[PDB]
């Protein structure tokens, strides 16, 4: 391993705050760009956003809200198989075109071939994963999300291969990985969508507790290079703080992004708001935090207990409705695509160029040297 | 686009706080350097400063004040065509040599061929842009500023070409761009002066909301390279916080700079001062903030509404008169030209050299390890 | 020295916060990885951790606690030879398998060939170093730690050679060094284990007072390269703040780490807790601080007094028991080895790869943009 | 100037916080290293320290105190020629070996060939510079310091050449410069000692107001390269915050350093202490601040008034005596020379090597993650 010894520090990594997209000749206005993305032949989104499979982010109510805005929700797995199946049934029974009380239309709703809202569901690697997958498919789930901390592991890959073999037609998302070799290993066993991100999440301590990770722009770019070879897709999962980071994640190769923090504290996230000193907040916590792993309500098999936590528990200010949050994100995405001359997301992924910057460039990019007197809806 | 794919992260960008000017052999004292600049055959400034075309920076009163100090003001377009024409008439009727009450002389006033103070005016891309340009020219405007967020866009370039074709002699400023190709596209349709800057403004959130921009020293240098080929000029617009940044912007290739924040809160900026807890302040806000776009007084056509804001609203401490602010900026410019051995701005643009530095170099450059006991007039 | 003149600034250095470990294909779960390390033929640890030889970190009580968890303690030398010999006798008489009051077992205890807890002891370079070493060996010490600020010095190397010559079988740790040439100079006189680190300690001011040091990841990597050539080992000493830094230190080539700050404020560190404003704390101080050097209780020879201090005196929040702290560190190490696919520490040292990152990458690695509401046991 | 255009951003610059000295094999203990330096054949210091020629740093009382510790003071020029001559006479009449009340010896005093304390004096470029130089020489001054903001200027070089021509034997210090070409231009007209530094001072705003400067480690190294060719010396002037920065400045090529901030607030600096909220402080201000330039006591010719200030006015905590401050600095220098294996300053300048580091390396170098409970005498 003298070869590995001499190359220990060769690789370099970039994150969102290291880069900007370069403006380019543009023939398309922001309101005319196409935000649609085909994640798999049977799974098309109208906005490139997945809500995170976390017990403070996505149950039925969030999955309904985000699918009606054109995305898709991943119902978390910290519940019994029967409970998670019923959450999916709630999504598939929900109104997808519009509701009255006076007329709220959902013209951009992401739907299956039968006009029902799309919905996804997380599963782990446990003895009962096949049963959970079976009951989710029977409930009408549109994608299974094999959600693991280290997707590039023999045990995970073997479990996916067995799932792919028994359930030949379900769309399989699997993750997380952060390297080309990890993405390739998953696509080679039949994964449809690879989820990218080790450590970048707002609530996570993986990089500090284990010392492991890849800066997220590099992780996306390295994994998207492999996805292009297979003709498949990736989800850029974690570390997105502003709408501009979504544009960066997609331009680096992401077909869609997954959001935790930016959707935390919305009306449709699980739990209720709590008033503290005249201010509204909601809980947001890592799925590897102590509170999230100490779940024990009805019985379910959980992933093998980790010795020490890899997330923290926190609270976020109340944000409002999912519809209003998505409206702000979409406006930012459309603005960025207009600046880069991208009429659709394929052009953004394939053609856009970045410029690297220092911490001084970052300070120039935010507002600077001004006393802000009102919070902007997209800059809180 | 495998070529674009492999070069996604090739480009690097520098901003003001990344660089310093290197001192050089100097035969000229600061008081003897020449700060004049010809922006176009009919538009000569005595100090290389344009005031920003913003509704909290420049109306008639600011345009008069800054032209009397040797610069030029861009009257903003958030008003009716008739109102904006009358603002220009106020500037062109104002005294340009001196006034009494006891004798205030303006020996460095920038004037047209008839001895009237110079004045510029912003226009957008709307159906009535030709009428606005016509009435501004009839009012005696010295330059039209085609003010757009993304100047490198087919719609903007087509509108400029049509304007250039109907009004063959007016000086046209157009922007904003941040790349060589964007500058070239504008000069090729007859723009006289290209305005450079995407995202660096103090009050702006473009880089964070859309993910797009270029660090401003690189943007200036890339665009000035093209201006040199055409024998035309550029305005370095945005991100200047100190007089030393003006010297940097000009040495990077800028023929002149445009200032928002450094002129905000002056007596001549629009609005009145407001006392808050014994301290004086004035409002300063992005033209892409909610308050600035929600203007609706007399009717006018506005640029197409953007879905989400790209600026914030803020307040700045009262600064004093435009004359005293310009005096401090000019003293800093003259000092920098003396250090670089530049007898005039052409030598500064063409000959001066920079040295790149880290964040540690930046901390050494400011005052450090001292409890400042009085604010300096040029270091507040 | 024109050769030295032209290469003054050639070398570059990395520390923990500059790098992350890259995840790799993994066939081993965290609970099955092997944390054992042979530091020398007669000195095997079950977890790769040495407690620092400091008078606020390690006396008999800490050495017992950490050996029972699988590591080894270095009893400090700021005491008489007789006192330090008695501390070692206390360790070697202590129960190593388990104790009652109800049954506390120590299944991972690091023991000598007679079933007694391992223990090490610091010595200096003074006239009586041979006598101190003799009495420590008679007490049953398992390793002597020649503890000096600048191990790459003629006086230190000559003293070690004389010790190695009189005491032919004792395990000798010597330090500190930070360069390949310094490590080589010590291994060449018979040192068994080289201790690496000049300036990285939490409580130390060496780099700021003397201007001297090497960023600690580079120091480890440079010295481990030499250790590999000799077939010997190194201790990565100083600058570790989180369990993830331990994984980084070992992957950079360290066979084991030495901890001060992460063990300060434990029940078993010397001194008692002091309540200040309802909060518990303990003292932690550099061995080069004024208070630590002004020791004058029973008489002992001290290293030559330094003119000015090179450490500070501080206080740390109470941490709890050594057992609970080690449990958190080990969980983090096991998680990192699982992510890197390392079944044992040899694979981590020899095979793991890093990715370099900016300050923006570091901010993404920690929790960001969240109001943490409870402290994590491994993220305080 | 297409050659200058393409090389605008080629040069890179380092400051103190960017680098560390690498430890090396050492045969010399800190107490045995030689801190002497010959600045010129008739000017030898016993510690390599000049006190700054500033009206809040050096008059007779500071010049006496620092010469008795082995350095030399530069009496500032913000006073009449007669007054400045009398300050020098006070220094040359002062006791240099020792004083009683009980016996204070000054065994390291820097003295002239007649046993009188060394002393230097600042002069400017004015019409009466020849008269000031004449009266200072008649008073027995050991060096004249031509103190200008931009030493690489025709007017300064012409004035120095005329001085060198009339006063053929006085030691001439001249500055400030920051480039090889500026140093060469001064040595070529007969300057004995070149003073290096544009912008790094604690109290100065030159880099922010004018945009001009060179990071100080690079400035020293570039200028020392020229000094080596001429067989002459340089003073590293400005930006030194800790004793470790002195070691860095000398290892980068400086023969001696000049200190402002580290000597401000001492008993011997001009002015008295002022109690503010139970705490002692003294004034410290740039010679380019408004208060320092608005001096108008007895009449003197001042350098041409600059339009705008290039320094600020501040206050520093009381530090104690010059003797105690120098003792701490010398201890740090001796420690660094011991670590680098430098028996004298020539070896430090010629042989020592640096390692470059990031901001993460800097945070590791200072104390980190500790609540300091007492201020160290060399780390306040
Ligand atoms: O290392 C981790 N420890 C955790 O406890 C944890 N919880 C969530 N996640 C991941 O973070 C993503 C959400 O990130 P953001 O809040 O930044 O959008 C999610 O989509 C997950 O990928 C975790 N990662
Ligand atoms: O992205 C933007 N969103 C906005 O809302 C906005 N408002 C002003 N500007 C631009 O900023 C310039 C002034 O910048 P400074 O205050 O830094 O001088 C101005 O001259 C404009 O170029 C904006 N840019
Ligand atoms: O330069 C120094 N001056 C000091 O006063 C000092 N005291 C301890 N040490 C060293 O720091 C190590 C502990 O570092 P941490 O607290 O970061 O674990 C220890 O293991 C030592 O190597 C010192 N280094
Ligand atoms: O640009 C400047 N504007 C000023 O007003 C000023 N005053 C002092 N100096 C220079 O700073 C040096 C002292 O620096 P320190 O306090 O960092 O030691 C001094 O030795 C001078 O070289 C100035 N430089």
Backbone angles phi, psi at B115, to 5 degrees: 80, 15
Of C204, C223, C334, C349, which residue is the catalytic one? C204
| Cα A131 to averaged position of ligand 1 atoms, centre (Å) | 26
Q: How many residues does chain B have?
A: 380
* Alpha carbons within 13 A on the beta-carbon side of C294: 8
What tokens appear for C115 in the block? 């079933």
Using what technique was this structure determined?
A: X-ray
- For the CA of D195, the closest atom of ligand 4 is 22
Nearest to B353 by CA among B196, B227, B247: B247
Q: Which helix (H) or strand (E) holds D224?
A: helix D216-230
**How does strand A98-100 pair with strand A103-105?**
antiparallel
Task: Find the residue in D nearest to B334 (Cα).
Answer: D210
Q: What is the 3-state secondary structure (H, E, C) of chain C?
A: CHHHHHCCCCEECCCHHHEEECCCCECCCHHHCECCEEEECCEEECCCEEECCCCCCCCHHHHHHHHHCCCEEEECCCCCHHHHHHHHHHHHHCCCCEEECCEEECCCCCECCCCCECCEEEECCCCCHHHHHHHHHHCCCCEEEEECCCCCEHHHHHHHHHHHHHCCCCEEEEEEECCHHHHHHHHCCCCCEEEECCCCCCCECHHHHHCECCCHHHHHHHHHHHHHHHCCEEEEECCCCCHHHHHHHHHCCCCEEEECHHHCCECCCCCCCEEECCEEEEEEECCCCHHHHCCCCCCCCCCCCCCCCCECEEEEECCECHHHHHHHHHHHHHHHHHHHCCCEHHHHHHHCCEEECCHHHHHHHCCCCCEEEECECCEC
Residues 6+ apart with CB under 8 A from D238: D197, D199, D200, D201, D202, D204, D216, D258, D260
What tokens appear for D75 in the block? 């009496």
Look at the block and give the residue holding tokens 């790769």: C48
Resolution in A: 1.9
Question: What are the residue ranges spanned by the domains of chain B?
Answer: 1-380
| Cα A318 to averaged position of ligand 2 atoms, centre (Å) | 30
Pocket-testing residue among B76, B260, B282, ligand 2, by greatest number of atoms within 8 A of Cβ: B260
List the beta bridge partners of residue B100: B103
Q: Residue of the nearest CA to atom 24 in ligand 4?
A: D204
Burial C124-142 (b: 16+ CB within 10 A, else e): bbbeebeebbbbbbebbbb
Residues 6+ apart with CB under 8 A from B239: A364, B15, B16, B197, B200, B201, B202, B216, B245
* Biggest alpha carbon–alpha carbon distance for chain B: 70
Does B309 lie at the interface with A, CB-CB under 8 angstroms? yes
| Cα A205 to averaged position of ligand 1 atoms, centre (Å) | 9
Cα-Cα-Cα-Cα dihedral sign, residues B235, B238, B243, B245: negative
Cα-Cα-Cα-Cα dihedral sign, residues B180, B186, B189, B193: negative
Q: Residue of the nearest CA to atom 18 in ligand 2?
A: B260
User: CA of C155, closest CA in chain A: separation in Å?
Assistant: 33
User: CA of C61, closest CA in chain D: separation in Å?
Assistant: 23
Cα–Cα dist B101/B66, whole Å: 19
Q: Which helix (H) or strand (E) holds B240?
A: none
SS3 A54: coil
**Residue A4 CB: number of other CB atoms within 10 A?**
13
Look at the block and give the residue holding tokens 């350093």: D257
Does A198 lie at the interface with C, CB-CB under 8 angstroms? yes
**How does strand C371-374 pair with strand A313-317?**
antiparallel
Of D204, D223, D334, D349, which residue is the catalytic one? D204
| Cα C312 to averaged position of ligand 3 atoms, centre (Å) | 10
- Residues of B with catalytic annotation? 204, 298
B-chain residues within 8 Å CB-CB of A366? 205, 207-208
Torsion of CA D225, D226, D231, D234, to 10 degrees: -80
From chain B residues 267-306, the ones with a CB under 8 A of any chain A CB are 281, 283-284, 289-291, 304, 306
Q: Which helix (H) or strand (E) holds B177?
A: strand B171-177
Cα–Cα dist A48/A71, whole Å: 6
Cα–Cα dist A315/A283, whole Å: 4
Does D148 lie at the interface with B, CB-CB under 8 angstroms? no
List the beta bridge partners of residue D316: D282
Q: Say whether A365 and B207 touch across the interface (CB within 8 A).
A: yes
Nearest to A15 by CA among A197, A195, A204: A197
SS3 C263: helix
Residues 6+ apart with CB under 8 A from A223: A177, A178, A179, A180, A182, A183, A194, A196, A234, A253
SS3 C318: coil
Cα-Cα-Cα-Cα dihedral sign, residues B358, B360, B361, B366: positive
What tokens appear for A327 in the block? 């409206």
Cα–Cα dist A364/A374, whole Å: 20
Nearest to A193 by CA among A254, A126, A119: A254
Residues 6+ apart with CB under 8 A from A271: A56, A282, A283
Cα-Cα-Cα-Cα dihedral sign, residues B198, B200, B206, B211: positive
Q: Say whether B20 and D4 touch across the interface (CB within 8 A).
A: no
Burial C161-179 (b: 16+ CB within 10 A, else e): eebbeebeebbbbbbbbbb
Q: Say whether A378 and B205 touch across the interface (CB within 8 A).
A: yes
Cα–Cα dist C233/C345, whole Å: 12
Nearest to A200 by CA among A223, A174, A219: A219
Q: Which ligand is nearest to the CA of D246?
A: 4
**Residue B344 CB: number of other CB atoms within 10 A?**
14
Q: Is C320 left (phi over 0), alpha (psi -120 to 50) or beta?
A: left
Q: Say whether A371 and B316 touch across the interface (CB within 8 A).
A: yes
The CA-CA-CA angle for residues C285, C289, C292, to 5°, reads 75
Cα–Cα dist C21/C18, whole Å: 11
Cα–Cα dist D26/C178, whole Å: 13
Which of B361, B368, B378 is the mutation pick for testing D, counting most D CBs within 10 A? Answer: B361
Does the domain spanning B1-380 belong to CATH 3.30.300.30?
Answer: no
Contact of A37 with A25, CB cutoff 8 Å: no
Pocket-testing residue among D204, D242, D295, ligand 4, by greatest number of atoms within 8 A of Cβ: D204
Does D352 lie at the interface with C, CB-CB under 8 angstroms? yes
Count CB pairs under 8 A between chains B and D: 226
Q: Which ligand is nearest to the CA of B287?
A: 2
Cα–Cα dist A170/A150, whole Å: 22
Query: Is C223 part of the annotated catalytic residue set?
Result: no
What tokens appear for C203 in the block? 């409580």
List the beta bridge partners of residue D208: none
What tokens appear for C179 in the block? 């360069």
Look at the block and give the residue holding tokens 């309540």: C275
């Amino acid at each position: 391993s003298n070869a590995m010894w001499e190359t220990k520090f060769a690789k370099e990594g970039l994150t969102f705050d290291d880069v900007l997209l370069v403006p380019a000749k543009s023939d398309v206005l922001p309101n005319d760009v196409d935000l649609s993305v085909e994640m798999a032949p049977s799974l098309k989104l109208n906005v490139p956003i997945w809500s995170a499979g976390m017990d403070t982010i996505t149950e039925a109510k969030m999955a309904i809200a985000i699918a009606r805005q054109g995305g898709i929700g991943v119902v978390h797995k910290n519940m019994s198989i029967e409970q998670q199946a019923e959450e999916i049934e709630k999504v598939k029974r929900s109104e997808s075109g519009g509701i009255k009380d006076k007329v709220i239309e959902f013209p951009n709703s992401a739907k299956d071939k039968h006009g029902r809202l799309l919905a996804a569901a997380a599963v782990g690697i446990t003895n009962d994963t096949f049963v959970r997958v079976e009951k989710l498919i029977e409930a009408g789930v549109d994608a299974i999300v094999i959600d693991t901390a280290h997707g590039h592991s023999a045990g995970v890959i073997n479990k996916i291969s067995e799932i792919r073999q028994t359930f030949k037609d379900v769309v399989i998302v699997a993750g997380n990985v952060a390297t080309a070799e990890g993405a390739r290993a998953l696509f080679e066993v039949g994964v449809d969508i690879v989820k990218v991100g080790i450590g970048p999440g707002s609530i996570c301590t993986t990089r500090v507790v284990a010392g492991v990770g890849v800066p997220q722009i590099t992780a996306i770019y390295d994994c998207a290079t492999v996805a292009r070879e297979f003709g498949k897709t990736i989800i850029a999962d974690g570390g997105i703080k502003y709408s501009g980071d979504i544009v960066k994640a997609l331009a680096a190769g992401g077909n869609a992004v997954m959001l935790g923090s930016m959707l935390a504290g919305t009306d449709e996230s699980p739990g209720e708001t709590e008033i503290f000193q005249g201010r509204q907040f909601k809980t947001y916590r890592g799925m590897g935090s102590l509170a999230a792993m100490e779940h024990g309500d009805r019985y379910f098999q959980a992933d093998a207990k980790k010795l020490v936590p890899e997330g923290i528990e926190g609270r976020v200010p109340y944000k409002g409705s999912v519809a209003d949050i998505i409206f702000q994100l979409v406006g930012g995405i459309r603005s960025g695509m207009g600046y880069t001359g991208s009429p659709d997301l394929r052009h953004l992924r394939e053609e856009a160029a970045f410029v690297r910057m220092t911490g001084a460039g970052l300070r120039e990019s935010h507002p600077h040297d001004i006393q802000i007197t009102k919070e902007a809806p997209n800059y809180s």
